[PDB]
């Protein structure tokens, strides 16, 4: 009968072990005990991205954003989902928003967000080149 916190911590351990479906299931159990914690959903979204399930990740980003509209990770993971779906303008907007929010919040993710923006812009440009 583990607590929500214990379940999140177990999920995190499984994530370290690269056991992504197991980690995601654990975050689901945490959500069952307390569904009002945005971090459970962004953690699970990351698992779904690693599992190549952007649709499931996107839904979790939406749940996260309803609880925490300022979530840097929700915007970033949303952008990644949208890139997989070939929705480039949306993806770039979400990555730009993640960058802006991280700055406002003084968070340090190294060059991760700018790197993602460059990938997104490169992919958008490639899509244009692929069609002419």
């Amino acid at each position: 009968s583990p607590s929500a916190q214990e379940l999140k911590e177990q999920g995190n351990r499984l994530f370290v072990g690269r056991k992504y479906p197991e980690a995601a299931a654990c975050y689901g159990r945490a959500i069952t005990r307390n569904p009002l914690v945005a971090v459970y959903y962004t953690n699970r979204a990351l698992c779904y991205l690693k599992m190549q399930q952007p649709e499931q990740a996107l839904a979790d980003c939406r749940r996260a954003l309803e609880l925490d509209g300022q979530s840097v990770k929700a915007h970033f993971f949303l952008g990644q989902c949208q890139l997989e779906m070939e929705s480039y303008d949306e993806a770039i907007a979400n990555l730009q928003r993640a960058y802006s929010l991280a700055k406002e919040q003084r968070l340090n993710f190294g060059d991760d967000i700018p790197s993602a923006l460059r990938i997104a812009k490169k992919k958008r440009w490639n899509s244009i080149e692929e069609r002419r």
């Binding site: 994530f15 953690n43 990351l46 970033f76 340090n108 993710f109 967000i113």
Partner: peptide, 7 residues
């Protein structure tokens, strides 16, 4: 630190 980690 990377953004692709769990909290």
């Amino acid at each position: 630190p990377t953004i692709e980690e769990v909290d």
